[PDB]
């Protein structure tokens, strides 16, 4: 049961890294524009239930990805992430006051994933 949970988080980790790596390969003027979009960050993210904070931001994530343009369709990878987040989290999300770019948003959730995987090894 703990192994199944770990596997899901690892798939989530790799999905998120995929988006970040895809974004990091955008051309600089396009990327500059993409970094103007605001993403909302959890006040605290240490537990699986805090993934609610990720779930709520998945639609804006999908939109920004759609607005940029690839071998992957945004609706497919976001759907995969959605399924995993929904099955993992199984509470109202508390948001931090300061917003973030798509990059720092992705970095934060990548770090969350890696932190939780580390408690399951
Ligand atoms: S900005 C040039 C790169 C690009 O086309 N992107 C927009 C669509 C996209 C990117 N990364 C991902 C991952 C998954 C789905 C779509 C996607 C960056």
From Swiss-Prot:
GO annotation, cellular component aspect: extracellular region; extracellular space
Subcellular location: Secreted
Keyword list, A-Z: Adaptive immunity, Chromosomal rearrangement, Cytokine, Disulfide bond, Glycoprotein, Growth factor, Immunity, Pharmaceutical, Proto-oncogene, Secreted, Signal
Predominant localisation class: secreted
Any one GO molecular-function label of the UniProt entry: kinase activator activity
Disulfide cross-links: 53-93
NAD as UniProt keyword: no
One of the GO BP terms on file: immune response
Disease annotated for this entry: A chromosomal aberration involving IL2 is found in a form of T-cell acute lymphoblastic leukemia (T-ALL). Translocation t(4;16)(q26;p13) with involves TNFRSF17.
Role played: Cytokine produced by activated CD4-positive helper T-cells and to a lesser extend activated CD8-positive T-cells and natural killer (NK) cells that plays pivotal roles in the immune response and tolerance. Binds to a receptor complex composed of either the high-affinity trimeric IL-2R (IL2RA/CD25, IL2RB/CD122 and IL2RG/CD132) or the low-affinity dimeric IL-2R (IL2RB and IL2RG). Interaction with the receptor leads to oligomerization and conformation changes in the IL-2R subunits resulting in downstream signaling starting with phosphorylation of JAK1 and JAK3.
UniProt family annotation: Belongs to the IL-2 family.
Protein name: Interleukin-2
GN (gene name): IL2
Segment of the intact protein contained: 26 to 153 of 153
């Amino acid at each position: 049961s703990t192994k199944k949970t770990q596997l899901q988080l690892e798939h989530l980790l790799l999905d998120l890294q995929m988006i970040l790596n895809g974004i990091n390969n955008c051309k600089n003027p396009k990327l500059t524009r993409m970094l103007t979009f605001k993403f909302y960050m959890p006040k605290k993210a240490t537990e699986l239930k805090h993934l609610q904070c990720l779930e709520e931001e998945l639609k804006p994530l999908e939109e920004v990805l759609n607005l940029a343009q690839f071998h992957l369709r945004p609706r497919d990878l976001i759907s995969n992430i959605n399924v995993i987040v929904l099955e993992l989290k199984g509470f109202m999300c508390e948001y931090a006051d300061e917003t973030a770019t798509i990059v720092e948003f992705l970095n934060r959730w990548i770090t969350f994933c890696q932190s939780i995987i580390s408690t399951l090894t």
